[PDB]
From a paper:
A potential workaround to the size limitation in cryo-EM is to bind a small protein of interest (the “cargo”) to a much larger carrier (the “scaffold”) in order to make it large enough to visualize readily. In the present study, we demonstrate a protein design advance that substantially rigidifies a cryo-EM scaffold based on fusion of a DARPin as the modular binding domain to a designed protein cage. Analogous to antibodies, sequence variations in the nonconserved loop regions of a DARPin protein can be selected in the laboratory in order to obtain a variant that binds nearly any protein of interest. The rigidified scaffold described here provides a number of advantageous properties for cryo-EM structure determination—size, symmetry, and modular binding—making it suitable for future applications to many important systems.
In the earlier design, the individual DARPin arms—12 in total emanating from the tetrahedrally symmetric cage—protruded separately from each other, thus suffering from residual flexibility. To make further stabilizing contacts possible, we investigated alternative design choices for a scaffold. Then, computational interface design methods were used to generate new amino acid sequences at the interfaces formed between three symmetry-related copies of the DARPin. The designed interfaces between protruding DARPins were proposed to confer additional stability to these key binding components of the scaffold. Drugs bound to a minor cleft region of the protein near that location are of key pharmaceutical interest, including covalent inhibitors targeting cysteine mutants (i.e., G12C or G13C). We therefore undertook a series of structural studies on known KRAS mutants, focusing on the degree of atomic interpretability in 3D density maps obtained using the cryo-EM scaffold described above; a DARPin with loop sequences that bind the GDP-bound form of KRAS was already known from prior work, enabling the scaffold to be readily repurposed to image GDP-bound KRAS structures. All three KRAS variants were found to bind with good occupancy to our cryo-EM scaffold (presenting the KRAS-specific DARPin). For the G12C mutant, the resolution was 2.2 Å for the entire particle and 3.0 Å around the KRAS protein.
Residue numbers in the entry:
A (entry chain A): 24 to 97, 104 to 165
B (entry chain B): 23 to 171
């Protein structure tokens, strides 16, 4: 129960920080972050229910992979928005660690762990893309 | 050693996947199975060496996930409590999936005694899922061919 509580709390922190950071990005990245928040809500629903409630699907992971591929062609906190995204990335890494702990303890959350790894990669890429576009 | 048991189960799963590939009649399924055999070599190297050598990358997991998404789109709604069998291709794929589940159990047992990268277990889970999808695709295509006549 303790790993479940810690993972859900870390995911709540991650989605709160993403909700804070989405007000500094453009409309496209704001919509991407809102979809990410919805996916985090699904992951929290699955983890808090110990897998009884269905969580995210592989389609969301494919969506994250497509975003990573699209943005991969293009000190933390080069800009303020980049700093917000870097903070979100660190919290996403911590949430990934917590979900990995949950998966070992209960066997639920493989797709969630994959999604969180891809999410940390995407947050890093989005911060770098914001820095590049603002510099350009 | 638990790693020895994991490696033996990997070899058995590789044999079963090779048999299913021989029985398979579709290019995409056979390409997936051959890539899975190569990734099983990679995963065995990752487990045996503890990560010093080649390791299971996120790219392989993402490839499995993309193939699973495409096959889910092709299949449509999936019914619960599927009886394994139907055709020799689907039966071999179900046997390979059962061996893959056994490999997942062996990896979970071994991780409690030694350090194993999480990507290994993630890939094993995705491999079981993709083998289930392969079996469903084989059954669906066989049924379509039978309905053609």
């Amino acid at each position: 129960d303790d790993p479940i509580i810690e993972a859900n709390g870390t995911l709540d922190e991650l989605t709160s920080f993403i909700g804070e950071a989405k007000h500094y990005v453009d409309e496209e990245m704001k919509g991407i972050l809102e979809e990410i928040q919805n996916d985090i809500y699904k992951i929290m629903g699955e983890i808090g229910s110990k897998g009884k409630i269905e969580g995210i699907s592989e389609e969301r992971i494919k969506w994250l992979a497509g975003l990573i591929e699209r943005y991969s062609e293009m000190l933390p906190g080069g800009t303020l928005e980049s700093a917000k995204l870097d903070v979100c990335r660190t919290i996403a890494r911590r949430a990934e660690r917590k979900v990995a702990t949950v998966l070992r303890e209960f066997g639920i959350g493989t797709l969630a762990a994959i999604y969180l790894a891809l999410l940390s990669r995407l947050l890093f890429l989005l911060a770098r893309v914001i820095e590049i576009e603002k510099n350009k | 050693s638990p790693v020895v048991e994991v490696q033996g189960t990997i070899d058995e799963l590789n044999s079963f996947i090779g048999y299913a590939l021989v029985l398979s009649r579709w290019d995409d399924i056979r390409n997936d199975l051959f890539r899975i055999q190569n990734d099983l070599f990679v995963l065995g190297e990752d487990v045996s060496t503890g990560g010093k050598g080649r390791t299971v990358t996120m790219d392989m997991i993402i490839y499995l996930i993309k193939r699973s998404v495409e096959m889910k789109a092709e299949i449509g709604k999936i019914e619960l409590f599927v009886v394994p069998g139907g055709s020799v291709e689907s039966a071999s794929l179900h046997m390979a999936r059962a061996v893959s589940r056994r490999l997942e159990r062996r990896i979970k047992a071994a991780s409690e005694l030694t350090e194993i990268n999480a990507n290994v277990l993630l890939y094993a889970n995705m491999l079981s899922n993709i083998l289930f999808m392969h079996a469903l695709i084989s059954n669906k295509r066989k049924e379509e061919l039978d309905k053609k006549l």
